[PDB]
């Protein structure tokens, strides 16, 4: 999950409480981790009419 808000306190894990056979576990962090990405090559754009 990226660019979103952070949890006010500690990490909160949200889940369903009926059965343990669940589809999604959502982990909401209280601190962000920065990720840096790049595509290092340089492309020329062309155009075909």
């Amino acid at each position, epitope marked *: 999950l990226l660019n979103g808000s952070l949890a006010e306190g500690e990490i909160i894990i949200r889940s*369903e409480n*009926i*059965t*343990k*056979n*669940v*589809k*999604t576990i959502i982990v909401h962090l209280n601190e962000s981790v920065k990720i840096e990405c790049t595509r290092p090559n340089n492309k020329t754009r062309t155009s075909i009419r």
Partner: antibody, heavy 122, light 107 residues
């Protein structure tokens, strides 16, 4: 009009592979999970695995881990199961069924296919 | 691993009498038990879900009650068409089934 359709299968030699499948309709294919189960005459029921046709990923019981694989095709509304390294221990009737729940967790179901046989013999 | 068993393996019922079967678990599966009916030669159908709720299409003669580690199924006025193999299933953890029991006609 929810229906499940299965093909039959032959008797294979030990070490051989088999492919079985199930087609289903009356409900959007990508909106639900599908299960495969196994039972042999004189035995009880076992769960083999689950496939999510929406994407997608699979999960299997450790019992068949490394021997069972599953795929899906959303253009035909079908799921496929394949078993490698067949042994006489796998002689059984295989079933395919639709799961229940879109809400966040899964429970269980009432739409079952007919049952297809796979046998293994020398 | 959720361990489920059933008793009696075979029940003998005089048609027209009510019949009972029960299931036991080694763990707590209290939020979600279910029962299924298997016809010889045909795919099974769901009868009870949510521990005690009747599945849609199931006649009032089919009922049951329980929670936790124990549950009993009852069929009022068991009819000849109701002699079948019955199974218990747990939804509180990775799905498993019990061995199953069968009801035979008393003669």
């Amino acid at each position: 009009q929810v229906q499940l359709v299965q093909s039959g299968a032959e008797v294979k030699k030990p070490g051989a592979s088999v492919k079985v499948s199930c087609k289903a309709s009356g409900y959007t294919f990508t909106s639900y999970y599908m299960h495969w189960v196994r039972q042999a005459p004189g035995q009880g029921l076992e769960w083999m695995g689950i496939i999510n046709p929406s994407g997608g990923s699979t999960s299997y019981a450790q019992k068949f881990q490394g021997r069972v694989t599953m795929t899906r095709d959303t253009s035909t509304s079908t799921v496929y199961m394949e078993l490698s390294s067949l042994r006489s221990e796998d002689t059984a009737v295989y079933y395919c069924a639709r799961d229940v729940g879109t809400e966040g967790s899964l429970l269980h179901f009432d739409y079952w296919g007919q049952g297809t046989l796979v046998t293994v013999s020398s | 691993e959720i361990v489920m068993t059933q008793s009696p393996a075979t029940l003998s019922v005089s048609p027209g009498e009510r019949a009972t079967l029960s299931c036991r678990a080694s763990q707590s599966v209290s939020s979600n038990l279910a029962w299924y009916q298997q016809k010889p030669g045909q795919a099974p159908r769901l009868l009870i879900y949510g521990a005690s709720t009747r599945a849609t299409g199931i006649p009032a003669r089919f009922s049951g009650s329980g929670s936790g580690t124990e549950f009993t199924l009852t069929i009022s006025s068991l009819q000849s068409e109701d002699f079948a193999v019955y199974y218990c299933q747990q939804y509180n953890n990775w799905w498993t089934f019990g061995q199953g029991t069968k009801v035979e006609i008393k003669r």
